[PDB]
Design a binder for this molecule. Structure first.
Ligand SMILES: *[C@@H]1O[C@H](CO)[C@@H](O[C@@H]2O[C@H](CO)[C@@H](O)[C@H](O)[C@H]2NC(C)=O)[C@H](O)[C@H]1NC(C)=O
Ligand SMILES: *[C@@H]1O[C@H](CO)[C@@H](O)[C@H](O)[C@H]1NC(C)=O
Ligand SMILES: *[C@H]1O[C@H](CO)[C@@H](O)[C@H](O)[C@H]1NC(C)=O
Length: 513
């Protein structure tokens, strides 16, 4: 596996591994066993089970420990049951002994007779047998033992047969490491396991490119080569976000302003980021951000012109009313500034004075202002400007609309004749005269209507340029009241006397059928 590093494998070793036996003859014997396919595997067998005592040694070649302290030894072997051999009770054994000795000499010519250390007496437990199909062996035992802590450049493994009936099929020697990994944006290197089978090796992580440490990244390498639960983390730098084990630049159109931010966010309305790894979003053309700001908050724009600009005049005092613009851009910080003028295109200077202008004349949150005390018979002109937190960045006169007005201009008279031209079950067509004395240019007419009955009465308004209108979508057989008034730059005339019209049962020709 990725957590094991093989120091020796007898099955890999080609062509007579070869191993020192003592005695050289009559002890452990090398013989090749045939697998399913392909090549032979060198094994060692002895079954000297009729002898009173046996001491047969077999020793590997020198094995480097590399950097390992704790080394594992996996032995696969077969064992013939003493009971299956006739009359060998008392001589025959079911175990063999395993030893090692550490050495800096990789060239030892003879098996040592003293300095070895016993790893264990190895027994085969029957119930743990495996079927090995590859080498054609029905009952194979596998036992693993471990040694350490190892301090020298290498070591020799030795097998002592005391009188068993045994074939050593394979020997694999290895150490364990926790494999290279990335955890919480910190890299942890391949780490050789500790000195004992219980050891934990503390490893400090390194921040990946390109991120910064938040809390010191640390993780334990367990002796089984598994990492334990890490602590600490690194955070992706601004303009980057965690993907896989890496901090990758924010994708086009996306941004991350601070390292403490989780992931990349798409640029908010009317801002964009044209480069990867963006920490900011450039405002779109015609769009801005106020000094009081969040780069997460969308860019905004100066509003459109205020709507339904309506003038009323009384003597020298001009009262004005308007409505919120169609496009705020948008923000709720909108306010209005009024602009006075005197002309009658060229020149038209400010009319500068100490006038009011009540309540404000600038930075105004309401839709009304009353102007008082300016001079009497002259044409003035007003611009009402819709303002917001931006527009100091791009002021334009189309953030305002104008009304030309004449002071001391009288309001128009009332209408005094309004007629129902055609009545159907759902509609009333109206027509009316111009007022006797418009006293100026008529800008539009307003029809006001409602149900005669006060309960469930809804007041509605229709505006028109012409002197007629068709009021549609009404209740049938229902009594309604209509009034009309005209507007000029001097304001509204008084409404006409009420005209009462009851819808009838005449079919609608629009609906047909
Ligand atoms: C305010 O402006 C109006 C519109 O221009 C002026 O009315 C015009 O006056 C001239 C003569 O000065 C006439 O020839 C036009 O026929 C008028 N226009 C209209 C209403 O049709 C008015 O004179 C100006 N008043 C002041 C005091 O400047
Ligand atoms: C002018 O406006 C005020 C508003 O209350 C009103 O009292 C006064 O009657 C108006 N003048 C005329 C000519 O009616
Ligand atoms: C981070 O450093 C690596 C080398 O470790 C370098 O190759 C790379 O350019 C850096 N990351 C960026 C900005 O792509």
């Amino acid at each position: 596996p990725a957590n094991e590093v093989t120091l020796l494998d007898s099955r890999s070793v080609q062509g007579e591994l070869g191993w020192i036996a003592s005695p050289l003859e009559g002890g452990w014997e090398e013989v090749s066993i045939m697998d399913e396919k392909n090549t032979p595997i060198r094994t060692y067998q002895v079954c000297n089970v009729m002898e009173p005592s046996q001491n047969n040694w077999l020793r590997t070649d020198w094995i480097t420990r590399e950097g390992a302290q704790r080394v594992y030894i996996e032995i696969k072997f077969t064992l013939r049951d003493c009971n299956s051999l006739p009359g060998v009770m008392g001589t025959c054994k079911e175990t063999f002994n395993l030893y090692y000795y550490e050495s800096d000499n990789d060239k030892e010519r003879f098996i040592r007779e003293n300095q070895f250390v016993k790893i264990d007496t190895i027994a085969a437990d029957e119930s743990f047998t495996q079927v090995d199909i590859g080498d054609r062996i029905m009952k194979l035992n596998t036992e693993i033992r471990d040694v350490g802590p190892l301090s020298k450049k290498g070591f020799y493994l030795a097998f002592q047969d005391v009188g068993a009936c045994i074939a050593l099929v394979s020997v694999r020697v290895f150490y364990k490491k926790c494999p290279l990994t990335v955890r919480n944006l910190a890299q942890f290197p391949d780490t050789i396991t500790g000195a004992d089978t219980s050891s934990l090796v503390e490893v400090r992580g390194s921040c990946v490119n390109n991120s910064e440490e938040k809390d010191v990244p640390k993780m334990y390498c367990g002796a089984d080569g598994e990492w334990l639960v890490p602590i600490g983390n690194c955070l992706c730098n601004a303009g980057h976000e965690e993907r896989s084990g890496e901090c990758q630049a924010c994708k086009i159109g996306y941004y991350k302003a601070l390292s403490t931010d989780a992931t990349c966010a798409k640029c908010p309305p009317h801002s964009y980021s044209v480069w990867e790894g963006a920490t900011s979003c450039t405002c779109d053309r015609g769009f801005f951000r106020a000094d009081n700001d969040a780069a997460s908050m969308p860019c905004t724009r100066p509003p459109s012109a205020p709507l339904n600009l309506i003038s009323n005049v009384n003597e020298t005092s001009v009262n004005l009313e308007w409505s919120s613009p169609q496009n705020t851009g948008g923000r709720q910080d909108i306010s209005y500034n009024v602009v006075c003028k005197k002309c009658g295109p060229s020149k038209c200077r400010p009319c500068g004075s100490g006038v009011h202008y009540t309540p404000q004349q600038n930075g105004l949150k309401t839709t009304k202002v009353s102007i008082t005390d300016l001079l009497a018979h002259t044409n003035y002109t007003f611009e009402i400007w819709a303002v917001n937190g931006v527009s100091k960045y791009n002021p334009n006169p189309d953030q305002s609309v104008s009304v030309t007005v004449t002071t001391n201009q009288a309001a128009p008279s009332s209408i005094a004749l309004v007629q129902a031209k055609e009545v159907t079950r759902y509609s009333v067509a109206l027509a009316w005269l111009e007022p006797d004395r418009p006293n100026g240019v008529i800008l539009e007419y307003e029809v006001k209507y409602y149900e005669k009955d006060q309960n469930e009465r809804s007041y509605r308004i229709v505006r028109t340029a012409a002197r007629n209108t068709d009021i549609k979508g009404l209740n049938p057989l229902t009594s309604y009241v209509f009034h009309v008034r005209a507007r000029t730059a001097a304001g509204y005339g008084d409404f006409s006397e009420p005209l009462e019209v009851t819808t009838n049962t005449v079919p609608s020709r629009i609906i047909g059928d």
